[PDB]
Design a protein around this nucleic acid. Structure first.
Ligand SMILES: [Mg+2]
Ligand SMILES: [Mg+2]
Ligand SMILES: [Mg+2]
Ligand SMILES: [Mg+2]
Ligand SMILES: [Mg+2]
Ligand SMILES: [Mg+2]
Ligand SMILES: [Mg+2]
Ligand SMILES: [Mg+2]
Ligand SMILES: [Mg+2]
Ligand SMILES: [Mg+2]
Ligand SMILES: [Mg+2]
Ligand SMILES: [Mg+2]
Ligand SMILES: [Mg+2]
Ligand SMILES: [Mg+2]
Ligand SMILES: [Mg+2]
Lengths: 92, 155, 106, 61, 197, 127
RNA sequence: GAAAUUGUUGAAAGGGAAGGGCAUUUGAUCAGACA
RNA sequence: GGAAUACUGCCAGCUGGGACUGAGGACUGCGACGUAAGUCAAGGAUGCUGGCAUAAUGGUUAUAUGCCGCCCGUCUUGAAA
RNA sequence: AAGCUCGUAUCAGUUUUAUGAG
RNA sequence: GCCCUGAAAAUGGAUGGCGCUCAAGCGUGUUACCUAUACUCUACCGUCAGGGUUGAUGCCCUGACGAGUAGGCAGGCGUGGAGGUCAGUGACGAAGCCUAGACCGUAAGGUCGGGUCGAACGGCCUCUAGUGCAGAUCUUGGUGGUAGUAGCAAAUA
RNA sequence: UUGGCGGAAAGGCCUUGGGUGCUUGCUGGCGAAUUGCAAUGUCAUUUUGCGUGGGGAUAAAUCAUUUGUAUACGACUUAGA
C-alpha cells in the first residue's frame, strides 16, 4: 500500500483490474476469430503444411489491413505445381 | 547417398520378459470394516451419504446398499479406501448376497437390479427398524461442521 | 444441510527452503486445527487439491485443479510437507487448499 | 569427499595393442590373443607381448 | 477462524503484537486493529520518548522531503513496527500488508463487531509486575499527534452507547437462561445430559 | 510400431546458451567455454548458467531415439529407403531436404509398400 | 538482398534500469502417438 | 520380610500409518513350506480397474510470482574499491 | 612418457619394542 | 556475578532490520526441530581397473572413482580446395537468406517443415591448407543515442 | 408497511401490522439407481451488454479572439451571442 493511504489496498486492486482486463481482451479476440480453433476442428491445420502463400492462393480461388500478400511469381508456380499434381491424380 | 548405412543393426527379435515372483494373495481389509457396518462415502456421486456394507468382492471392492428405500443409494461397489467405517452396525444375517459379483456389475434399467434391490431392501428395513432413529440417521447426509477435527472425531 | 464440506481447509505457506535457497518441488502446508506433529500424522498420505478459477473455459469448466498429497510432517507446530504433480505457482503463498479424507484408514 | 591413498584413474598400460596398421600383423595378433587366452601357456604370453613391440625394440637376430 | 479478525489493541505490547500480526498477514489472514492509542511499549516513558527523538533525528540532509517520514499517530507507530517485520518491497509483502487495517478508536463498522485479544502479546500476562511501561497515546501526543482529545471524546460516546446495548443484551440473557432452566427437568434434557449436552 | 524401450529420460532439455549471448548481438548462442581466469561462470558461482559436462549424457539404451522409438535415417531415394527393409521397428526414414516433390511421391509410395515409417511425409506435397 | 539501425500493425510488460538461473501459474502457439 | 516399578540393555517377538524407487528381461543360483506332486515374499513389479483420446499430459514462446545472480576481457597477491 | 626387471617384491609424513637425548 | 561512570567530536543511520525487559538480554541444563554440492541407498553418464567371450581396437559381467590455473594427453565438431565412390541431390527448384514450427547430440554441431530465391551442390573413404574471433585506443565499410538539440546573434535597414 | 435511533469512514441497529412460503416439534405414503470403484465434478453478490418497457433531466469545457492584478513557453487571471 501507499504511505499516504495505508488502509486502502493498492497492488491488489491493480492486480484485480489487470486480470479482468486481460480476460476481457482474450474473450474479444476469440469472438473476433483471431485465435486458432481446436485441434480436432474441421478447419484446423494441425499436422498439415502451414503456408501463407497457399492459404492466399486457395482463398483467391475460393473467391481490413494485412501484410499477407502473394506474389505473381509464387502464384504461377502454385498453378504449375497443381497441374502437375492433377496430372498425377489422373494417371494413378 | 544422404547417409551412410550403419555397419551394425540392432536385432529385431523381441526379448521375452523374465519370470516374475509376484503372487496375488488376498487383500486384508481394515479391522473396522465388518459386514453390516454403516459407512460414510467420501467420494463420488453419493458422497457424504451413509450406506450399509454387505459383502467383500473378488476385485477388492465393497458391496453396499442404501438401502434404496431409505436414501436412494442402490446396490453398488465402492473402494474400501474411499469410505469411513462407523461404529454403527445393523444385523445382516437375513440378507442373501451370494448372487452379486464382478460379472453381475459388468457394463460391457434391467429390472433384475430393481427386483434384487427390493429383495435385499426388505430384510434391511426389517432389521433397521429395530434400532431407534436409525432410518433417519441413514437418510441424513454427513458433512463437516465448523471446528470439526477429523483427527479427533470418533466414528 | 447448510454445509456440504468433506475436506479440511489448509494454507499454502511457502516452499521448502533454507535461508537463501528454496525448493519448489516441496510445499509447506498448514492444516486448520492441527497443532502438533502427532496430530499431523493423521493427514500423511491424504490427497490435496488447490482449486482455482480461470476465465477461459476448458473442457466444460472454469474451475481448475492442481493435485498433490501430504508426505510428512514439518517442524513442531503441526505443519506438513506436500508434493503436487505440478509445483504450486508461488503466487499462492497464503492461498487456500483442500485436504480430503481419502485414502482413508478409519 | 574421500582422502585418496592412491592416484585416481591411473592406467596400467603395458602396451595393450600394436601401433601398426598391417592387416597381416593384426591377424597374427588376433591368433596369439586367442592362444594366450585359451591355453595358459607362458610361451604364448611372451609371443603376444613381443608382437606389440616397436621397431627400435625388435632388433634383428 | 474468522474471515476478518478484529484485534483490540488496548493493553497489548507493540512488538509482540506486530510480530503475530505480521505472521498472520503473511499466512493470509485479514486483520483489523482498533484502539491503537491504548497500546503499550515496555520501558519508561522518557526512554521511549528518547527513542522516538532518535528516529526524529534521522533525515535526508540535502532534501528533508525524501527522508524517512516520521508519522506521529499511534496507528502509524504500530504500522512502522509491523512494516519492519514484513518484507514490504516485494509484491508478496505488499499483498500481505494490504490485508491489514489499523485505526485509532473504534470507528464504524467495527464498533458493532466482536473484538479479540492476543494473549501472547498482552501486558498483564507478559510484563513482570512493577516494570514500567509507556502508553502510545501519550507518546504520540508528546511527539506531535494532535487528535488525542477528539478520539477520547468519540470513545466516551461509543462507550455510552455500547453500555446501553450490553444492558439490553444482559436482560435478554437472563430471560433466556431462566426459560432454559425450567426445561432441564424433562426427558429430552435428561437424554441430552446423558450425551453430554 | 517400434521396438519396446525404457521410458525416455532427458537430463537437460534446455539449450546450453553461451554466456552474454543475451547481452550482445555479436555474441552468438552457440556454446563456448569461458577461458577467463576471473570468470564467475568458469568458477561456477551460485546463480550462473549451467555448463555442459559428461554427467548429462543420456542413457545408452534410449540414445538417438525419437519419441516414437525409432532412430532417424536420412534417405535420398528409393534405393536408400530399401536399406531399412528389415529394420522396420528400429529405424524410420526421413526424406532429405533437397528431394523434389515428384520424387517424394515415389519414395512415399515405396515406403508405404515396405511398411517403413516416414518422419516427414507432408513436405512439398500440399494438396 | 544478412546485421546494426528505423517505420507501421498486432500482442505484452513498466511505482528510481534491463538482462540471466531453478520452478510453476496464465495467455498464445505447436509436434508426436491415434488401434 | 515379601512384592512391584523406574533406568539401562537384549529378542533370528508381533503389528498399524506415510514417502521415494521398480534398474534387469527365456532358463541356470542359494534357500524356504510341504511325506509328496508342487508352491513361495528365494539372483530387481506385477495384477485388477477407470477416464481421456486431444491441446488433455507435454514442448515452445510472452510474461507474472518466490528465491538466487555485480561487467566482460586483460594485468597485478588482490580487486566493487 | 618409454623400456628392462621383480611382484610376500618394494615399502610407510603411524604406532610398538630396545637404546640415546632432554 | 550482573548494572552505572571508567571521554566524545562534527551530512541522517544502524546488535543486518523490526523490535525485545519473569526477554526475543546474560550463565547453564534437557529435549524437539530446520537444512549443504557432506554422509547412506538407488538410477543414469563418463573414466579407470579386474574378468569372460571362435560389429574381436566389438559384445557381456564385476568393482571403485569424478575439484582444478599454466601445462600435458586423447576422442570429436565445423570451413576453402584435391583423388575415389554414392551410375548421389537439382528448373515438380541447387546454393544462400528469414522463420511465434519439429527432432537428435553433454557439447562443438547436425537434421526436417514453412517462406523467399533462382543454378548449382552434398554424404562417405581419403589428401591438403591463406581452416573457426568479442576484444588488439585492431583494419575497411555501414549505423545509432546525443537531437529536431547546440546553434544559423560581427560589418546600423 | 409502522415508528425510533445512528455523522468517526453514519450506509447500519432496533421496531409496528397484515400478507405470502417453509418448518425436522411428532407420525405416514411415493421418488432417487447406469456420474457404472474416485476425478473441485462446477451450486454463493454485483452486472458502463443487450431486447421489453411504464416514469424523470434537457449541459458544459477546451482551441481561437480578449485583459494584464500574470507570464521564458506552458500556466494564471479577465472579457465576449
Ligand atoms: Mg566424489
Ligand atoms: Mg535487389
Ligand atoms: Mg534488423
Ligand atoms: Mg502444461
Ligand atoms: Mg542478490
Ligand atoms: Mg534470533
Ligand atoms: Mg539461555
Ligand atoms: Mg531451396
Ligand atoms: Mg588466418
Ligand atoms: Mg567482430
Ligand atoms: Mg579474447
Ligand atoms: Mg575499437
Ligand atoms: Mg569506424
Ligand atoms: Mg534552438
Ligand atoms: Mg549585422
Amino acid at each position: 500500500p501507499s504511505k499516504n493511504s495505508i488502509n486502502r489496498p493498492k497492488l491488489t486492486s491493480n492486480l484485480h483490474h489487470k486480470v479482468h482486463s486481460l480476460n476481457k481482451k482474450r474473450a474479444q479476440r476469440e469472438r473476433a476469430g483471431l485465435l486458432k480453433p481446436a485441434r480436432s476442428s474441421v478447419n484446423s491445420k494441425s499436422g498439415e503444411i502451414k503456408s501463407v502463400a497457399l492459404d492466399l492462393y486457395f482463398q483467391n480461388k475460393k473467391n481490413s489491413i494485412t501484410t499477407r500478400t502473394l506474389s505473381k511469381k509464387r502464384a504461377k508456380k502454385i498453378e504449375r505445381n497443381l497441374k502437375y499434381a492433377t496430372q498425377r491424380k489422373l494417371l494413378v | 547417398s544422404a547417409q551412410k548405412a550403419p555397419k551394425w543393426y540392432p536385432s529385431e527379435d523381441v526379448a521375452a520378459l523374465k519370470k516374475t515372483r509376484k503372487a496375488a494373495r488376498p487383500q486384508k481389509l481394515r479391522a473396522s470394516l465388518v459386514p453390516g457396518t454403516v459407512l460414510i462415502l467420501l467420494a463420488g456421486r453419493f458422497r457424504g451419504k451413509r450406506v450399509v456394507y454387505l459383502k467383500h468382492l473378488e476385485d477388492n471392492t465393497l458391496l453396499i446398499s442404501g438401502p434404496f428405500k431409505v436414501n436412494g443409494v442402490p446396490l453398488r461397489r465402492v473402494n474400501a479406501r474411499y469410505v469411513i467405517a462407523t461404529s454403527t452396525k445393523v444385523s445382516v444375517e437375513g440378507v442373501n448376497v451370494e448372487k452379486f459379483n464382478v460379472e453381475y456389475f459388468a457394463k460391457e434399467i434391467k429390472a433384475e437390479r430393481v427386483e434384487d434391490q427390493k429383495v435385499v431392501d426388505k430384510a434391511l428395513i426389517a432389521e433397521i427398524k429395530k434400532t431407534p432413529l436409525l432410518k433417519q440417521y441413514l437418510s441424513a447426509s454427513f458433512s463437516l461442521k465448523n471446528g470439526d477435527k477429523p483427527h479427533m472425531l470418533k466414528f | 444441510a447448510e454445509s456440504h464440506r468433506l475436506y479440511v481447509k489448509g494454507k499454502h505457506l511457502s516452499y521448502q527452503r533454507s535461508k537463501r535457497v528454496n525448493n519448489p518441488n516441496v510445499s509447506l502446508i498448514k492444516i486448520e486445527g492441527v497443532a502438533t506433529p502427532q496430530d499431523a500424522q493423521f493427514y500423511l498420505g491424504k490427497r490435496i487439491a488447490y482449486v482455482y478459477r480461470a476465465s477461459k473455459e476448458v473442457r466444460g469448466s472454469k474451475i481448475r485443479v492442481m493435485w498433490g498429497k501430504v508426505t510428512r510432517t514439518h517442524g513442531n507446530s503441526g505443519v506438513v510437507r506436500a508434493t503436487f504433480r505440478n509445483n504450486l505457482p508461488a503466487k499462492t503463498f497464503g492461498a487456500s487448499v483442500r485436504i480430503f479424507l481419502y485414502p482413508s484408514n478409519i | 569427499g574421500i582422502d585418496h591413498t592412491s592416484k585416481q584413474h591411473k592406467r596400467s598400460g603395458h602396451r595393450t595393442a600394436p601401433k601398426s596398421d598391417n592387416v597381416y600383423l593384426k591377424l597374427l595378433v588376433k591368433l596369439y590373443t586367442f592362444l594366450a587366452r585359451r591355453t595358459d601357456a607362458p610361451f604364448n604370453k611372451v609371443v603376444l607381448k613381443a608382437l606389440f613391440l616397436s621397431k627400435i625394440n625388435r632388433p634383428p637376430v | 477462524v474468522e474471515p476478518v479478525v478484529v484485534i483490540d489493541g488496548k493493553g497489548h505490547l507493540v512488538g509482540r503484537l506486530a510480530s503475530v500480526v505480521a505472521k498472520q498477514l503473511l499466512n493470509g489472514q485479514k486483520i483489523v486493529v482498533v484502539r491503537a492509542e491504548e497500546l503499550n511499549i515496555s520501558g519508561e516513558f522518557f526512554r521511549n520518548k528518547l527513542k522516538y527523538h532518535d528516529f526524529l533525528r534521522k533525515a535526508t540532509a540535502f532534501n528533508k522531503t525524501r527522508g524517512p517520514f516520521h508519522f506521529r499517530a499511534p496507528s502509524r507507530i504500530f504500522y512502522k513496527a509491523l512494516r519492519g517485520m514484513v518484507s514490504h518491497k516485494t509484491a508478496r509483502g505488499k499483498a500481505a500488508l494490504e490485508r491489514l487495517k489499523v485505526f485509532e478508536g473504534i470507528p464504524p463498522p467495527y464498533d458493532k463487531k466482536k473484538r479479540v485479544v492476543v494473549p501472547q502479546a498482552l501486558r498483564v500476562l507478559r510484563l513482570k509486575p512493577g516494570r514500567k511501561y509507556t502508553t502510545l497515546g501519550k507518546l504520540s501526543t508528546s511527539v506531535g499527534w494532535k487528535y488525542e482529545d477528539v478520539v477520547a471524546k468519540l470513545e466516551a460516546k461509543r462507550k455510552v452507547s455500547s453500555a446501553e446495548y450490553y444492558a439490553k443484551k444482559r436482560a435478554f440473557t437472563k430471560k433466556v437462561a431462566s426459560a432454559n432452566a425450567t426445561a432441564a427437568e424433562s426427558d429430552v434434557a435428561k437424554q441430552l445430559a446423558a450425551l453430554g449436552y | 510400431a517400434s521396438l519396446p524401450h525404457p521410458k525416455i529420460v532427458k537430463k537437460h532439455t534446455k539449450k546450453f546458451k553461451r554466456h552474454h549471448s543475451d547481452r550482445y548481438h555479436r555474441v552468438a548462442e552457440n556454446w563456448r567455454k569461458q577461458k577467463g581466469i576471473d570468470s564467475v561462470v568458469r568458477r561456477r558461482f551460485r546463480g550462473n548458467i549451467s555448463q555442459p559436462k559428461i554427467g548429462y549424457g543420456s542413457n545408452k539404451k534410449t540414445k538417438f531415439l525419437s519419441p516414437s522409438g525409432h532412430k532417424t535415417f536420412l534417405v535420398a531415394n528409393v534405393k536408400d529407403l530399401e536399406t531399412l527393409t528389415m529394420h522396420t521397428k528400429t529405424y524410420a526414414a526421413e526424406i532429405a531436404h533437397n528431394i523434389s516433390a515428384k520424387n517424394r511421391v515415389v519414395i512415399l509410395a515405396r515406403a508405404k509398400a515396405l511398411g517403413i515409417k516416414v518422419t516427414n511425409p507432408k513436405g512439398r506435397l500440399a494438396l
